[PDB]
Symmetry: D3
Subunit: 160 residues, 6 copies
């Protein structure tokens, strides 16, 4: 079963948008969001990836309790939120903690309630509403198969 | 200068939507929001009011630090967020703490930055997005004069 | 479908054990727990009940986010944690928010994962470990039918 | 052994100064402090007292973990912080939770480390530094005997 | 007087169990605990040690306020919680902040109240209760002399 | 316009005083403050500086919401709190987030309310009150021009 390490940048509940300077590994404040929204899940990026936009591949991790920024979490993917913004493709792999039997009932995109999925989508559809020149479109939930393929691809680009 | 007591129901930052049962004064959980949004300001209602929809008149209070639900805050109005939802008129009086010289620079709607005002509006425009049969429209910022008039009116209805 | 109001005394995560003086409705600190444990769910009591031990019937409410002490939550039962302590029967009705379609998949005790149920049980089996003269035994999960019956019974005693 | 109920208005750590309207029992925001200071202990007032300034007698309660505003705590006194401000005498009874054997080693003012006592004093000496027309003087730690006497006195005035 | 640096992995109050990948120094989520328990003290490991189980020697640090994961704290030992789990010896050195006169009254294991010591023990006796194949036994508090000896030993193994 | 990276060591609200070991970049607990005070702003140091006391130049960053320790924030200076302590000059550059139009109204020291400036000063005047052999004097607010000059100077010393 595929699994990888996600470095969580942003705990669920946060309106501060944290980033990593990937050359140093330092945590940075990108910005305080302009909309009254909060990250709907712990959010970060998969280590050792280069995604379809030449940046590390982003990840959403479902957790019973948020972690802190900078924290590593072994995760396995269950689907992906495909999406395009002002800078191109900017997909978000949906994950759950790997090796944790409490999440064994969550295997594919159909195992996550439509309420959570809609909430996550709503966040990404709207979080940049009040930033001029930023938008998101082509918002679309896809399944684990497509998540794994995109992870695989992005692991190769990182090595190549 | 007009001033009144706001009972804060919801601290800034909250996705739990709290209410008061007005016959008992008890704090109640209305619902956890369906959108990944958080109240942009401390939010409650003005004591001893009956607003244009037969419910107590709602208030937003700007604070350097949030309070807890149930807490009273002496406030003075500086503008109002006019708005209509599925149940009619549902305006929100914008306030600052009364008698606090740190807020003396905030007198009318023009004294609050467009960033905060847009954020507040965005919240109310979108918080009910994923609740079917609920919407908001006629979103409009108005000045202190109109806030005071609507407060006055609603104080009378409460007595009448 | 049965539903009732729970007054939450203790948010999930708390080692402070809060109580209500039922004659006044005031929130009181019973004690800081002696064990390094935290309430596994929001915890309180059902309003207008007299349980099998002459005290109000206790409730556990599953929530996506904790509330504050004193808060009312409309809830419906899905099972019960039967249990006896030094002062007799001291059952805990397991609930979810009433009228919230996000919890519609949770109808009976079999709909709650064994992990959560074991965790809840573990808490009540051990929280009083270091208090001399206090114990719990006859720990047993039962279904909604038995929860409703015990609620019904306790509503009658409150009126009688 | 003397004991009484303290209604905690302010958790340790807070820069929001909460009050009670004693005619209604409602919690109110008095003000956000003007100095960058935080209450050094849970702070409130003893129920059913009228202190030497015609206001309820104030209490500091040592706790392993703070409570929320409005919460009642059975407490016993161990000393008092005598003090005078712009409105006269404004003493603060130092307490620990009554009936809790974890605090049995704390019986009189000499049982509380000089570090905590100095910190508490420092708070009250300085919290009003930037409020014009407010000051505190005659800051003085006294023992349990004097605390009990002042409590007793203030219980009588409340009845008389 | 012996002193050393502890890297705190887990603040007091946490049910998320954090770890360090010792080759990278990165903070990692080991798991969310399966029991409704919370770390009773700030918890981590002593830098530059190899303990009796070939892993870094673990430390509990008493603090007036928790730190964040990853934080270094100069500490001095006052006793040790000896203990064996499924993977062998897994002792926990009890410490207080070095060079802080507020902790000068705490010199040896007898200076820490039996309540805290019992609570700490209870945590480690039970935290793994619901993890199959994990247990702890030979739980035993020992004094500073034995703590220092075990630290010394583990400093040597790290160099050897 | 001048801008630089501040590594925030201490979030606003904290009584734990965090430090960086500048040779390793590790976050360390310096001490829990002895006074009941809390940092009035996010506090840290400007990367790649050597200030007038041979230590990195310290920075205060105004934020709508605090960050975590270790976090980098692109900032631009708007003034400086000049100050001398037991170890010499120990100035604090006042900053706001660089590239954030919400702070464009804050350009020089006159753009920050006297209330915030007095609060910040009060903190540094008093935070060491109960530490023997530590003091601060020559407390003085100066403008952006002088802040930039001192930053420039300290960037050179770091290279030289
Ligand atoms: Ca990113
Ligand atoms: Ca960016
Ligand atoms: Ca936009
Ligand atoms: Ca309302
Ligand atoms: Ca409603
Ligand atoms: Ca809708
Ligand atoms: Ca109870
Ligand atoms: Ca009790
Ligand atoms: Ca027991
Ligand atoms: Ca008072
Ligand atoms: Ca007052
Ligand atoms: Ca003054
Ligand atoms: Ca470890
Ligand atoms: Ca492990
Ligand atoms: Ca086990
Ligand atoms: Ca420093
Ligand atoms: Ca230092
Ligand atoms: Ca000093």
């Amino acid at each position: 079963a595929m699994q990888f390490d996600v470095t969580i940048e942003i705990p669920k509940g946060q309106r501060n948008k944290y980033e990593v300077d990937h050359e140093t590994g330092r945590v940075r404040l990108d910005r305080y969001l302009y909309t009254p929204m909060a990250y709907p899940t712990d959010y970060g990026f998969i280590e050792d990836t280069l995604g379809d936009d030449g940046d590390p591949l982003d990840a959403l991790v479902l957790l019973p309790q948020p972690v802190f920024p900078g924290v590593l979490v072994a995760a396995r993917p269950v689907g992906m939120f495909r999406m395009v913004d002002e800078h191109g493709g900017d997909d978000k792999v949906l994950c759950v903690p790997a090796g944790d039997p409490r999440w064994d009932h969550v295997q594919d995109i159909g195992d996550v309630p439509a309420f959570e999925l809609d909430a996550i989508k709503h966040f990404f559809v709207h979080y940049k509403d009040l930033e001029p020149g930023k938008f998101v479109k082509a918002a679309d939930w896809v399944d684990r198969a497509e998540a794994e393929a995109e992870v695989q691809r992005s692991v190769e680009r990182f090595k190549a």
